[model samples]
Target: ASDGDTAMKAFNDTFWDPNAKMFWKDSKREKHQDFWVEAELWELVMDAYQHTSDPALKAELKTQIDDVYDGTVAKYGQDWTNNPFNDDIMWWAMGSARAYQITGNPRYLEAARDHFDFVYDTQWDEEFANGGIWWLNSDHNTKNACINFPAAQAALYLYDITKDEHYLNAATKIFRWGKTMLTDGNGKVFDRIEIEHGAVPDATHYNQGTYIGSAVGLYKATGNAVYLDDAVKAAKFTKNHLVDSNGVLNYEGPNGDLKGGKTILMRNLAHLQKTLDETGQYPEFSAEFDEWLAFNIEMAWSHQNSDHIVDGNWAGLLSGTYESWSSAAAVQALNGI
Candidate 1:
């Protein structure tokens, strides 16, 4: 399988709006991508940064890091309270936390802390849906895996950065509650639970990814094997079920949201892979996961367009002007692997 270097550069060329300093929603350059989608794009840029050893590419991505942040703020503003989606804010907060770790920029750290604190203090619920963050600020009818796991992971990210017990405990509580409410016994994560209904068991790749992330994160922080076991279960579920006959991850769309879900999935899966290999534990699981990513990367690269845009449909036809979000999945996998 080919590396992500050229593919990432291709994505930036096709999607980046120089004026806006953010990616376009689609390759046709119709509109600027949505807030949360752009957040993932920032992480992908960081993925490229993390993957590169070439000084030129590294310097480019390093500058793009602050550019993406500044460009996003200029487009969306510094204050995020105007947006109703809690998960959306949490996504950027987590990205900012990572940026802080990378750049040692206090502003990035401040942004990460403030947004996470706002969402945590305001969106968290105690009596509703057995306790988790609501998806929207005004809506209290349901608590979702969307907000919960990301927020939990965000809290832990802060915990890792600041060495704060407050963040760690917050993450611990949130993950425990979300694991019970959002997951089945076999470790498949459902979408969201409504006030009138329970177990909205339409497992998507993004939610599964965040679930694995939080579980692995919690395991690392506390040295609890349960969290590791949970991560493995979720990975197994994604591998066993969320796949085509050829075992490539079976996600495809022109829609912006789910198509980009695999980006997050691959990011955290790589996180899980590194931890397992480094610790010399779960060798079989690590090996299986590694093979899966390579297989997908090889398959997608084989179908690439001349412009270096990877096919969104990993196992399907690789043709036409693909959505920027769709190509992000393959781009992420290439770098992540």
Candidate 2:
């Protein structure tokens, strides 16, 4: 019934373990996907549920989402403090918060709220970057966009669900600090502010997506045009600046963290578009941006493997073992369109 259906089949057939209810580490199915990657897989499941039209698929996705949650918790547990990386915890927290929103699951909300509180209380330091969350508990020298943006995103989700003023205020503070120190006027969100490296100007897909997500979330909550302006600008930076010669999103990676970048970016791009769709703002960009996503979806599908697992490179084919992150990104591109 659909192209995403086949790509999704490849994703499950190649990388998912139904019994374990977890995605594999790679095409070889050697080990389960790592913590950060597993959280992203959960989001991909949600993306499929949100974008699907088939009622039967929707029914399956509902179970798959719950199953994935159970599978993950059985392995990793709701107590995430054992993980040293604050970003890792927040990524799962944000995804859990998202799951709660979609499924009305109190377990998801409780875990999300608890984990966020843990991260913010322990990781936030007034001593660094004039107040920002530390990237790692063990190493407190840097404040990566990875942690800050996801923290804001997690907070925004909780705020919407609980109507908690604390979440909104926390989101605002983190967004403001990140927007000031981590990003430039051109909508380029640098990787992080390492006390050692200072402002590392490398722009990755995940940070760009999170920056826009944080910005758009603020705009949604406050009804402020300034935040919307930054969101549009950041989206342009990704769609226009970060591209291949043919203008698809640059091949982020099929490796570890890089492979997950497009998936994060794709989701938030859709998030920004939803705001425009709902508010009737950015009419010109909305029409143009929709076409861009459609083109990427076509390209991602055309370059897919014989196994129907699409490559991370929308501009070309990988022709090697596919990872869950890139596979989900392609499936994401198809359904997101």
Candidate 3:
């Protein structure tokens, strides 16, 4: 219920706009910045429904989707090319799939499927180290753990919605590529390896979480023990290497060291906590993580204006700066607590 409360508050303020019939990027400077982001918006609404089951929230979610398709899809298509994060595409497709699951709406499924088809048809051929996906179509160059994670999820989501083996096959290939090249021999996941830019392979908390989610999605879909094994290895590795005694998740090494330092970002912590939750270890870390998150929420609140909205740390990057996904994550983390 606490998580539900957090999600409701954040979504109502920043993500959803009843008057405009769409979602916004944030509450401040770029307020009402009506970029039709699929993943973040989908994530917020999905979590909203999951936690609260509010009919009004669901209605608003449908409105946002309708607005995007009616207002933006003609111009941007399903990809939302106005912004180019691969996760955005993944989340859009993912949200569509979720909406289909709940509402049995073929239109949602059709939209997601078409966009996903576009992704592979164009982006899959960009490059391949070991039959893996490219980061994006325009680059056709770099490959990262984060990108592959969502790519695999998109494929698996397709499989879930359609029950087609082709999508599953694509997911398998991506996962295989990840296990071969991106994962360390010690079971740690890498951030990405740049083939063209000479950027070396690196690891981070964010990538690890995506890897976990991909693995879990595969395991859930196939009932495959091997996927579960990979998930456990990655989750355990992250817990041992990145999580601190203070229960804060760190964004450290491709080498599994503590040198890169720790962060208190809502997104990173949410993913880590989700990994722990999926592994059934949340009870062990729950109290400690809960206190850590409560402290974060309270601290964020201190940054609130007279308007009672929290702002992120300007000097800091990622979630501390009022990221949409971070707010979603914060809501989820608070729910776990």
| RMSD in order of candidates | 1.6, 1.7, 6.0
In terms of lDDT, model 2 sits at: 0.85
lDDT of each: 0.87, 0.85, 0.57
Indicate the residue-level lDDT of 13 in model 3. 71
Task: Give every collision pair in model 3.
Answer: 3-335, 39-91, 191-202, 312-320
Per-residue CA lDDT of model 2 for 1-337, tens digit only, reads 7776666666878998988889997888888988888898888888888777778777888788889989988988869888999999999999999899888989999989999999988788888789889999886789999999999999999999999999999999889888888899768998989987698998988899999988988998998899999999999888877888787888766456886688889888888888887788999999888888888878877887789987676776554777788678888776652
Instruction: Rank the candidate models, highest TM-score first.
Output: 1, 2, 3
Q: Which stretches of candidate 2 lie over 4 Å from their true place?
A: 317-320
Best by lDDT: 1
**Candidate 1, residues 1-337: lDDT per residue as tens digits?**
2367888888888888888788887778888888898888899999989997778778999989999999899978998877889988999999999999899999999999999999999888888776888899976787888889999999998999999899999999999988888889678998998889876998888999999999999999999999998999999999888888889887746555787788889888988888888997789888888888778778878878888887577775434667777779888887773
Clashes of each: 0, 0, 4
The digit string of per-residue lDDT tens for model 3 on 1-337 reads 3445545565567555565544455544254433423344444455555556456765765555456444445545554533455545655665676667666778888867876676666566434565566666566566777667767877887898889999998888888788877887555887766776633456565566667667767877787777766765775676566645644454243231222112212333455456556666546564555565566555444444433333323112333344443334434444331
Candidate 3 lDDT at 151 equals: 72
Please list all clashing residue pairs in model 1, or write none if there are none.
none
Select the stronger candidate by TM-score from 2 and 3.
Answer: 2
